[PDB]
Amino acid sequence: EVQLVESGGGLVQPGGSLRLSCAASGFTFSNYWMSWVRQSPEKGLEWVSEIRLRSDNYATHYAESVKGRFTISRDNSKNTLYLQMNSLRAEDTGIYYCRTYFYSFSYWGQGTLVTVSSASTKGPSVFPLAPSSKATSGGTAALGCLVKDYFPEPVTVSWNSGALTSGVHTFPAVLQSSGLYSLSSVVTVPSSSLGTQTYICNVNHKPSNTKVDKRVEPKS
């Protein structure tokens, strides 16, 4: 099975630097062209660079937007691809996908997120969304977790250590009036189960290595 595992992403200050890596496995790395593509909500998909074979004198190409600032390189002995990013700009922010070119099309990794911001990481407090009388329609209750003021993305939420999945809605983060992220996660359950089943949201914010488990209990 073909795998491409990006690493090295994360939060960096404007004008600083970062080196991504891509650990390839499951094919003969040195036989294939390799590339980097990036993604943002604001510009879409943007090709970044490409490097070819040893027999091509390891020819490189770059989108104009990064030429002179980024360097693609490959270590055929370690099956690893690299992107060295210097003089980073706010506009370099996004998801960076490693890719391998199988002769007529690319296969893509799952990408790593690069945040170019003057902010320091910030881990969120977590508050309950208390199921209450009235706010619960026809035998079905709703309860949730509110994850306020964190930076950067992402945060993840599971319920009861992943044993509660059915009826879970975890919303996209919103960027607040402050430069910070907020996200809510909610779940619908049987009203009758509110006294007998305990409900806990498991919140993880890896950029700050915050890990919170918050009991949500009906108001009293």
């Binding site: 879409g44 998909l45 943007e46 090709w47 490409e50 190409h61 989108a63 104009e64 996908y97 070119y101 007529s104 099309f105 690319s106 296969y107 893509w108 990794g109 799952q110 990408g111 407090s125 508050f127 309950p128 969304l129 208390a130 209450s132 009235k134 706010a135 619960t136 329609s137 026809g138 079905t140 709703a142 949730g144 509110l146 306020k148 809605h169 975890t170 919303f171 996209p172 983060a173 919103v174 607040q176 907020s182 996200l183 809510s184 909610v186 619908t188 108001k219």
Partner: protein, 218 residues
């Protein structure tokens, strides 16, 4: 550069519809490096893009039979001959043979389904958040369709304007519905000040607008 123009930017189609997505270049772009060998992709939210068609018209291994590509000269189309519920995604073309490589702006494909009225729930701010001096009020809209919905915050019957933010899930992979959060944020003070807290919901699936409310202090 060899840039493709992808159209439309979005569309809603019912299960079973024929869907058609186009990428175009100019009579100039075509003289510069020929009729090119476009690939077509889809992307589910939070996932890497997946190959559907390579070299214009070759369905990729494992790709279901309803997907097909064709195209001549300037105009390339991706066709879905009978849309299925798992097919909501952003679809895009890739021009990956002529440097510099580029991508189409993409087509957001939504599944059209019967109207569904949201259920609605309201949550007061926790004790923990008041200790810290902010007060978040949250109104939930669950499992409704279409996406378009009006949520109005009313505090002591006074409509609020610019202190609300909404978040909306992607189309649900199980029933094609949306859910929606609206979060009204106010200082601990503004909150202790007033007493009745309400969000009023208006959706195509509701005969009349639904109001969920609470009074501060149980």
């Amino acid at each position: 550069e060899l840039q493709m123009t992808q159209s439309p930017s979005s569309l809603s189609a019912s299960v079973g519809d024929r869907v058609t997505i186009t990428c175009r270049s100019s009579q100039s772009l075509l003289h510069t490096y020929g009729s090119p060998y476009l690939n077509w992709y889809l992307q589910k939210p939070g996932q890497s893009p997946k190959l559907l068609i390579y070299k214009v018209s070759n369905r990729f291994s494992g790709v279901p039979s309803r997907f097909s590509g064709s195209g001549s000269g300037t105009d390339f189309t991706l066709t879905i001959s009978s849309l299925q519920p798992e097919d909501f995604a952003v679809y895009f073309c890739s021009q990956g043979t002529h440097l510099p490589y580029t991508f189409g702006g993409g087509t957001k494909v939504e599944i059209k389904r019967t109207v569904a009225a949201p259920s609605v729930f309201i949550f007061p701010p926790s004790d923990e958040q008041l200790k810290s001096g902010t007060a978040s009020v949250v109104c939930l809209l669950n499992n409704f369709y279409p996406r378009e919905a009006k949520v109005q915050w009313k505090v002591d019957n006074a409509l609020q304007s610019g202190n609300s933010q909404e978040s909306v899930t992607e189309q649900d992979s199980k029933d094609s519905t949306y859910s929606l959060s609206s979060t009204l944020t106010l200082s601990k003070a503004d909150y202790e000040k007033h007493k009745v807290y309400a969000c009023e919901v208006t959706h195509q699936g509701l005969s009349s607008p639904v109001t969920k409310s609470f009074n501060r202090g149980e």
